[PDB]
């Protein structure tokens, strides 16, 4: 007939876009709003579905600062579709364009609202558990949010709070791996269930890595991923924080901290936030919005 996808009743779909995916996210356009939208796409024959429910984690989210706004969720032809907010570039997009490596004003600049913006997935009794450079967009180039650090795919996201009971998830242990292990932390390389601390450690070894260029336990292979887990983990634990991150007192309290924080405890947040804003302040920046990639060229599918 007319040979065109279209999702719900005035999203055209169009093409493929973005590294990866093999066809699951696509550009798309709101016909009747002369918009563009981003179009995340899973086959009904998916053995393992998240689309849908990363839409109901999305609801539960809310409108929200740093939050993509959802506007559909419905079948296109073989397809389930979740159209929402078409974004930017991401934080390794932006990590590659600034020559592998941050300057710390950069990284305070996006630290300091990640934290505010994890602190919002945990205030809807949601964890994240999917920290990476990848998962965190700017906004686009005019839509006034493009300074704004966005998060995005909650297909791994959990309920740490039991809707019913409103009692934090049991403690556990022999949760099998499959998030990505260069960031993770030390406790989800030893199998237990993640919880609000997790999601913030993540963020502590992503930090550094901008921070540095690379972690030490990024080149580790292994014949299985179980073992490649291993020795992550193995790495992690063996290298003490002070090395870690040397040179960055700072970010060094900011991780052990996390660390040892227990598995129910609530992060203090404020504490979080204020090490990074003083440390910011003394540095004599100014939270301006002019990251390392301002001034350089960005990738626009559009
Ligand atoms: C609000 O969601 C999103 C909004 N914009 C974009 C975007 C924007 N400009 C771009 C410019 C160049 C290349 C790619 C781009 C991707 N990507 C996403 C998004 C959500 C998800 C993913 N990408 C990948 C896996 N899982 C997800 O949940």
Same mark, same amino acid.
């Given at each position: 007939?007319?040979?065109?996808?279209?999702?719900? $009743?005035?999203?055209?779909?169009?093409?493929?876009?973005?590294?990866?995916?093999?066809?699951?996210?696509?550009?798309?356009?709101?016909?009747?709003?002369?918009?563009?939208?981003?179009?995340?796409?899973?086959?009904?024959?998916?053995?393992? $579905?998240?689309?849908?429910?990363?839409?109901?984690?999305?609801?539960?989210?809310?409108?929200?600062?740093?939050?993509?706004?959802?506007?559909?969720?419905?079948?296109?032809?073989?397809?389930?579709?979740?159209?929402? &907010?078409?974004?930017?570039?991401?934080?390794?997009?932006?990590?590659?364009?600034?020559?592998?490596?941050?300057?710390?004003?950069?990284?305070?600049?996006?630290?300091?609202?990640?934290?505010?913006?994890? &602190?919002?997935?945990?205030?809807?009794?949601?964890?994240?558990?999917?920290?990476?450079?990848?998962?965190?967009?700017?906004?686009?180039?005019?839509?006034?949010?493009?300074?704004?650090?966005?998060?995005?795919?909650?297909?791994?996201?959990? &309920?740490?709070?039991?809707?019913?009971?409103?009692?934090?998830? $049991?403690?556990?242990?022999?949760?099998?791996?499959?998030?990505?292990?260069?960031?993770?932390?030390?406790?989800?390389?030893?199998?237990? &269930?993640?919880?609000?601390?997790?999601?913030?450690?993540?963020?502590?070894?992503?930090?550094?890595?901008?921070?540095?260029?690379?972690?030490?336990?990024?080149?580790?292979?292994?014949?299985?991923?179980?073992?490649?887990?291993?020795?992550?983990?193995?790495?992690?634990?063996?290298?003490?924080?002070?090395?870690?991150?040397?040179?960055?007192?700072?970010?060094?309290?900011?991780?052990?901290?996390?660390?040892?924080?227990?598995?129910?405890?609530?992060?203090?947040?404020?504490?979080?936030?204020?090490?990074?804003?003083?440390?910011?302040?003394?540095?004599?920046?100014?939270?301006?919005?002019?990251?390392?990639?301002?001034?350089?060229?960005?990738?626009?599918?559009?």
């Amino acid at each position: 007939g007319s040979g065109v996808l279209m999702v719900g $009743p005035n999203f055209r779909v169009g093409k493929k876009i973005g590294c990866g995916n093999f066809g699951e996210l696509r550009l798309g356009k709101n016909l009747y709003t002369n918009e563009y939208v981003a179009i995340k796409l899973e086959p009904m024959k998916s053995r393992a $579905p998240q689309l849908h429910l990363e839409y109901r984690f999305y609801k539960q989210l809310g409108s929200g600062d740093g939050i993509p706004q959802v506007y559909y969720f419905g079948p296109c032809g073989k397809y389930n579709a979740m159209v929402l &907010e078409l974004l930017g570039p991401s934080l390794e997009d932006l990590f590659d364009l600034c020559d592998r490596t941050f300057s710390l004003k950069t990284v305070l600049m996006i630290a300091i609202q990640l934290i505010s913006r994890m &602190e919002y997935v945990h205030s809807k009794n949601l964890i994240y558990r999917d920290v990476k450079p990848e998962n965190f967009l700017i906004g686009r180039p005019g839509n006034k949010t493009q300074q704004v650090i966005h998060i995005i795919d909650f297909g791994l996201a959990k &309920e740490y709070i039991d809707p019913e009971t409103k009692k934090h998830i $049991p403690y556990r242990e022999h949760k099998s791996l499959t998030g990505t292990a260069r960031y993770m932390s030390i406790n989800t390389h030893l199998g237990k &269930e993640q919880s609000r601390r997790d999601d913030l450690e993540a963020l502590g070894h992503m930090f550094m890595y901008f921070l540095r260029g690379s972690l030490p336990w990024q080149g580790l292979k292994a014949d299985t991923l179980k073992e490649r887990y291993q020795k992550i983990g193995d790495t992690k634990r063996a290298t003490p924080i002070e090395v870690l991150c040397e040179n960055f007192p700072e970010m060094a309290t900011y991780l052990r901290y996390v660390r040892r924080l227990d598995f129910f405890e609530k992060p203090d947040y404020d504490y979080l936030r204020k090490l990074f804003t003083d440390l910011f302040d003394r540095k004599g920046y100014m939270f301006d919005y002019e990251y390392d990639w301002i001034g350089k060229q960005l990738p626009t599918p559009v």
